[PDB]
Design a protein around this ligand. Sequence first.
Ligand SMILES: [Cl-]
Ligand SMILES: [Cl-]
Lengths: 140, 140
Amino acid sequence: GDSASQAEQFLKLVHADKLTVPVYAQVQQMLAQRFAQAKAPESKKAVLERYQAKANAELDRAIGWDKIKPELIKLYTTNFTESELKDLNAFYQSPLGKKVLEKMPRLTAESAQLTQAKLQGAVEPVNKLMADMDKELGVA
Amino acid sequence: GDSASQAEQFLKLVHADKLTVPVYAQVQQMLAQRFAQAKAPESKKAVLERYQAKANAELDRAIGWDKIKPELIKLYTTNFTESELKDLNAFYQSPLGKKVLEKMPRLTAESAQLTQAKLQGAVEPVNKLMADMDKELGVA
Ligand SMILES: [Cl-]
Ligand SMILES: [Cl-]
């Protein structure tokens, strides 16, 4: 019924269209890295300009929002009811919903930096640990 | 004020304690892989049992929930008000909140498999594209 419209509104509110940005950036940085890698005359950077446009168009063919959007709507309409999607929209339309969306990438990154920093403390003991098992079983 | 209690309830509802499970699994699979790698007498698997317990205890020292929990509460209480955290708890306590929490890992995985599958279609054209730029600039 009116589920697809609510699913579409959800993907907009959640900025699911920007999920591909890392792929477009990686291919753009790869070309400039390939341009530098050999020769690199800054007088011919307009040649890199068209090859970066070509790569952008080729990604748009495979992973453009118009290709992704239909299959994500099927994903949400099959997993949620029209009423559930409407309520998800009400939450993400709300000031708190918008606050969660902006904070989440940074909160996730800060949360992961914290754990990775702490985990480095277990590197030396786990290295010693495996070395002791290899010693005990008679290895090297 | 009563923010820390609400932050603690949030981390419980969201299962932030299970965020470390991949690290514990990787270190457990690494020891069994190291056990197989050289010799491997199944009569001495009780030796791997204690080394896997040792590794579990060493990770608990660095990245145990008791070490992670205090710094995540500071993260949420500084980024959200007590009232905002209370409302986040109301949403994730609700049947729809619980449905979102269960669906999200699978919806994220399915969403990423879809994009990666489509992206493989742009592999050959982007490879040809870079090869043509290397050809045009006079490389190999
Ligand atoms: Cl609100
Ligand atoms: Cl509900």
